[PDB]
Amino acid sequence: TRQARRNRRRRWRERQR
RNA sequence: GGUGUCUUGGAGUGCUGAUCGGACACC
Q: Concatenated DSSP letters for A1-17?
A: --STTT--------S--
CA distances A13 to A10, A16, A17, Å, are: 10, 6, 9
The protein residue nearest B3 (Cα–C1') is A1
The protein residue nearest B20 (Cα–C1') is A6
How was this entry determined? NMR
Question: Which strand B nucleotides have any atom less than 7 A from protein CB atoms?
Answer: 2-14, 16-23
In angstroms, the CA A13 to CA A17 distance is 9
In angstroms, the CA A2 to CA A8 distance is 12
At residue A8, φ and ψ (nearest 5 deg) are -115, 155
